[PDB]
Ligand binder design. Structure first.
Ligand SMILES: CO[C@@H](C(=O)NCC[C@H](c1ccccc1)c1ccco1)[C@H](O)[C@@H](O)[C@H](O)/C=C/C(C)(C)C
Ligand SMILES: [Mn+2]
Ligand SMILES: [Mn+2]
Ligand code: NA
Length: 304
């Protein structure tokens, strides 16, 4: 394998962490290949659930608990902290909230969150690498509570970063927020990628094509598919009651991705940095409710 930049995996990984059996588990957690039979049963449908009142309450809850766990992780980002140490803290914080860490064993993903540094686009596997001053790191949290999943991410700065890092992270966050600002009933899912790409391209960045936002509720990934690039052909129209994520990955160089031999870590083919933000959104009559927003602070963590 020829690595595309300076990052390398730092092995061995810690043995898989158990979740006590009093915590409710999603279907894939005990499938040997981590397959979700409830998702597979819906693979080839473009149909989108209209959430009931009960479902919306269940989503509001799990998404606020997910935000609290991302905030725990944010508090730990400093030079010399390993991404495994962040994942251990995340795993305990989900269990403290009587939630299961949705990524764990999802298609046999081996950890409880994703930690993506620098050229990693997404799905990085927490490992023994200490964070370095100058890194950008994304921590991606998903919790499962009472049958519902809540999913969010932010990119963070590890100590002092260069100007390129600052601009890429800021632009990525703005891409996400301008797409959220367009969400309301009657808008096509395919429109968000036009917005995101327009703003990324204005800043000299590119938009990853291989990974998309998605419906989420009782299933971790379901309809709609929500691409982040322009002129995509996604199917569907937003209605009050739809819940889904927007999670753009924007890159300093070209958009092309590849995956590491671990079968998870997605990286820029050119080795240049990539940043991402994600929120879980519910469409309301007035636009949308950001289920995974901060309730106690105006800005994302990188802007402190
Ligand atoms: C970019 O990452 C997302 C993803 O893989 N989005 C792809 C979604 C997918 C998809 C499928 C085919 C092509 C492109 C996207 C989809 C949409 C609707 C149904 O399935 C995940 O949703 C991410 O936010 C989550 O935190 C990490 C999850 C793992 C446990 C998997 C690491
Ligand atoms: Mn996520
Ligand atoms: Mn997601
Ligand atoms: Na990255």
């Amino acid at each position: 394998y020829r690595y595309t930049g300076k990052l390398r995996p730092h092995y061995p990984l810690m043995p898989t962490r158990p979740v006590p059996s009093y915590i409710q588990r999603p279907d894939y957690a005990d499938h040997p290949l981590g397959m979700s039979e409830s998702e597979q049963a819906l693979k080839g449908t473009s149909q989108i659930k209209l959430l009931s009142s009960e479902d919306i309450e269940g989503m509001r809850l799990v998404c606020r608990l997910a935000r609290e766990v991302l905030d725990v992780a944010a508090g730990m980002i400093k030079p010399g902290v390993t991404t495994e140490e962040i994942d251990h803290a995340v795993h305990l914080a989900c269990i403290a909230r009587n939630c299961y860490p949705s990524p764990l064993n999802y298609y046999n993903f081996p950890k409880s969150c994703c930690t993506s540094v620098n050229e990693v686009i997404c799905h990085g596997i927490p490992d023994r690498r200490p964070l370095q001053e100058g890194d950008i790191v994304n921590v991606d949290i998903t919790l499962y509570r009472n049958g519902y999943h809540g999913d969010l991410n932010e990119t963070f700065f590890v100590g002092e970063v260069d100007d390129g890092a600052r601009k890429l992270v800021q632009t990525t966050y703005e891409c996400l927020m301008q797409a959220i600002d367009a969400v309301k009933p009657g808008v096509r899912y395919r429109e968000l990628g036009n917005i995101i790409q327009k703003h990324a391209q204005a800043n000299g960045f590119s938009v990853v094509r291989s990974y998309c936002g998605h419906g989420i509720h009782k299933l971790f990934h379901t309809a709609p598919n929500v691409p982040h690039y322009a002129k995509n052909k996604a199917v569907g129209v937003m209605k009050s009651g739809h819940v889904f994520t927007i999670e753009p990955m924007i890159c300093e160089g070209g958009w092309q991705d590849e995956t590491w031999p671990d079968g998870w870590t997605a990286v820029t083919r050119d080795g240049k940095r990539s940043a991402q933000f994600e929120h879980t959104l519910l469409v309301t009559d007035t636009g949308c409710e950001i289920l995974t927003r901060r309730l106690d602070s105006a800005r994302p963590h990188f802007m402190s």
